[PDB]
Amino acid sequence: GTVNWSVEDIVKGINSNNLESQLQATQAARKLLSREKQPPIDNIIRAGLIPKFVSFLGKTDCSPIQFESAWALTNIASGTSEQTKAVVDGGAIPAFISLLASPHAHISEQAVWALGNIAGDGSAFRDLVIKHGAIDPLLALLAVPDLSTLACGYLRNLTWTLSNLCRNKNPAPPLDAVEQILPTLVRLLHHNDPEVLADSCWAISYLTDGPNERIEMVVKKGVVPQLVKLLGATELPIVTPALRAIGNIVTGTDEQTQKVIDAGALAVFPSLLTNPKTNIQKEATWTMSNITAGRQDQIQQVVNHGLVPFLVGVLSKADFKTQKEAAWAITNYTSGGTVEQIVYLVHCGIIEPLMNLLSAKDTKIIQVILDAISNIFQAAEKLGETEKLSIMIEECGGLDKIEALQRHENESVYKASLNLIEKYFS
């Protein structure tokens, strides 16, 4: 009967010289902290029960109290930064790392969960858990011939804790830690469980978010084909982190973007750029923007996959953030592409949505659209077709928009509109 205990009763039971009374009070505190409607985490912390739970973590001859205190500390460290800090101050990190090697599977899983929460608090606690040496037993827990023999929740919690170990920047995870975790991450990226796949993709996206050296560290393991395969999956919790990782990779060197292209990622984008989920569309358009900022052969590969009509459609009707990413994509396309590629972009119907988006209040998208229009005008000048494209701009009402932008607030906006009017509309 350890249900709905009072904090006073829990303190009275824990402070007793009875190990069984201590276990009963600890299970009561666990059931109290596992409740959904505002668990009194601060009330438990003020009572000074965290050191008692940390000490109970070490009672190897009493595994039930170990499991109960581990669950309680897990649910306490799952709260705010102050509560996780209070858990850490009690000396719980080395105790949980010691419990990682417990013969009882549930106690080891609880230690994994608690360490995952502590590392997910932030970068400082993540690096502190790494310094305490959790990576070695965490990876030893997965040194099995087939991951299918492990329990589902066990594998999921281990994958989530590993992902939290790769999470957060400023500072980024240590290079040695990332290199140690990466093979197990590549192995988890091929498991059949959807949650494990989603968390592994989240970890890969965390690792690829930063300098190109980290992106190369991830790419050298050859996970890009599997990343594209998971990008083609049907479960949105799997597609989202896969798309994030693909974008983070295409933010690097042109060789990494070419590695992404070689895996066949562009074939998935016809559905990604028309995904009913707004965030998926926005992230796909951002990835496309960074791909259009690459070499001319990469732009030609974008063209070959018929993604220019999809970019036009996203520019015409989508979320405003998706439309901003599309404008960035068109600007990168026109600035990096050949004159024939810009002519093809015009033939796909880019001028009408490019003009219709000039009525937005965001200044940055206005500058982006003006730069794109400028680049198309330079292409037409190289082709001697300035008059026809000027007629095109004037027919859809874009000339009126540029003339109204001539008297705009931002310096770049009005200087651009004036340049374009005086150079191609006189």
């Binding site: 596992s34 669950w71 709260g79 996780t84 989530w160 933010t251 900022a293 960035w328 990168n332």
Partner: peptide, 10 residues
């Protein structure tokens, strides 16, 4: 140019 947690056991 290119452009660039905690769970509770219930």
């Amino acid at each position: 140019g290119r452009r660039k947690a905690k769970r509770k056991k219930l």
